[PDB]
Design a protein around this ligand. Structure first.
Ligand code: 2LP
Length: 175
């Protein structure tokens, strides 16, 4: 590692991580499963009706957006969604002990997973939870690679799986 490469971990954090996996879009779009999304991975609704999505949008931003937001508004919604995922882990009796056992980088991958799937989705991975607590990283990653979450949209999930395997930021290098 060069002096610069050793600096790369101090530049990575949950916000930079999710920003890479989710992208940044200032107009309403459909994500890889066809669900209306905006900003940095903010799922607006699962309904096929673009009208619900715009209404959810104006609600979340608090103005008449007509489907378009600013970078600063994107950042704000994103920070709220990150806070919600972390809070969702910490209050949950099953996820909190596993999260507490993890190192800082794998904790970021855990918050990313919850941001993407939701609390009950993640807490259903009974086996992967036990694997992670037992530091069985290879097995946890192979089992996450069996999931619909990863297989229906691999490019959004692949870096998170690699990060559970390694506990480093290497999958976020060299975009
Ligand atoms: C079970 C998969 C990973 C994971 C671990 C701990 C907390 C949340 C989370 O998504």
């Amino acid at each position: 590692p060069t002096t610069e490469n050793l600096y790369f971990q101090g530049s990575m954090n949950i916000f930079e991580m999710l920003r890479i996996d989710e992208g940044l879009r200032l107009k309403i779009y459909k994500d890889c499963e066809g669900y209306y999304t905006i900003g940095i991975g903010h799922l607006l609704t699962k309904s096929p009706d673009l009208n619900a999505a715009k209404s959810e949008l104006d609600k979340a931003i608090g103005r008449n957006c007509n489907g378009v937001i600013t970078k600063d508004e994107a950042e704000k919604l994103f920070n709220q969604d990150v806070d919600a995922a972390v809070r969702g882990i910490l209050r949950n009796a099953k996820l909190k002990p596993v999260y507490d056992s993890l190192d800082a980088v794998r904790r970021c991958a855990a918050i990313n997973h919850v941001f993407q799937m939701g609390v009950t989705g993640v807490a259903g991975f009974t086996n992967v939870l036990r694997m992670l607590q037992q530091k069985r990283w290879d097995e946890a990653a192979v089992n996450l690679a069996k999931s619909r979450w990863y297989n229906q949209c691999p490019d959004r999930a692949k870096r998170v799986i690699t990060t559970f395997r390694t506990g480093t930021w290497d999958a976020y290098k060299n975009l």
